[PDB]
């Protein structure tokens, strides 16, 4: 389903692998997806968090303090954890239920929160990014930006 991901959403996932590697973690968890979303920092999801009054630097630091750092260098391709797989699954579910036939950073954000149990959802909900509130913010930003913020895969 990655061929339906926007350029920024594909970049979030690519960066999530390097956020795990930089922390010596041989797994890509919900925490590293969120770190990669902050590192991308510019799409619909990032702007949605900012418009709710949430500090992206604060989110990043709180995630860091929880997860610490591993001991050994991960080589090669780092695997998604089962909860990160659920995030990706719920990103597709959230897009389809919004009437969307693509997957953007906004759907990754909604999937992180709808997954609920992982470090990402714990940090985001604490800071006020409750799922309903985030989804309504996302819809407002998609209207405001009129398709001009996040290019869809090979899209006109």
């Amino acid at each position: 389903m990655f061929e339906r991901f926007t350029d920024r959403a594909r970049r979030v996932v690519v960066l999530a692998q390097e956020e795990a590697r930089m922390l010596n973690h041989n797994y890509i968890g919900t925490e590293h997806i969120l770190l990669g979303l902050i590192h991308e920092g510019e799409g619909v999801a990032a702007k949605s968090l900012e418009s709710l009054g949430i500090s992206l630097e604060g989110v990043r630091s709180q995630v860091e303090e929880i997860i610490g750092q591993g001991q050994q260098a991960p080589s090669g391709h780092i695997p998604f954890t089962p909860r990160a797989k659920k995030v990706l699954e719920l990103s597709l579910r959230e897009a389809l239920q919004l009437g969307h036939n693509y997957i953007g950073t906004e759907h990754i954000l909604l999937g992180l929160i709808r997954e609920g149990e992982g470090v990402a959802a714990q940090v985001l909900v604490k800071l006020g990014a409750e799922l309903t509130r985030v989804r309504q913010q996302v819809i407002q930003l998609l209207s405001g930006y009129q398709g001009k913020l996040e290019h869809h895969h090979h899209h006109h």
């Binding site: 389903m1 990655f2 999530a16 391709h77 998604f80 797989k85 990706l88």
Partner: peptide
């Protein structure tokens, strides 16, 4: 899909 970057 759905295991690695980008499968």
């Amino acid at each position: 899909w759905x295991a690695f970057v980008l499968i």
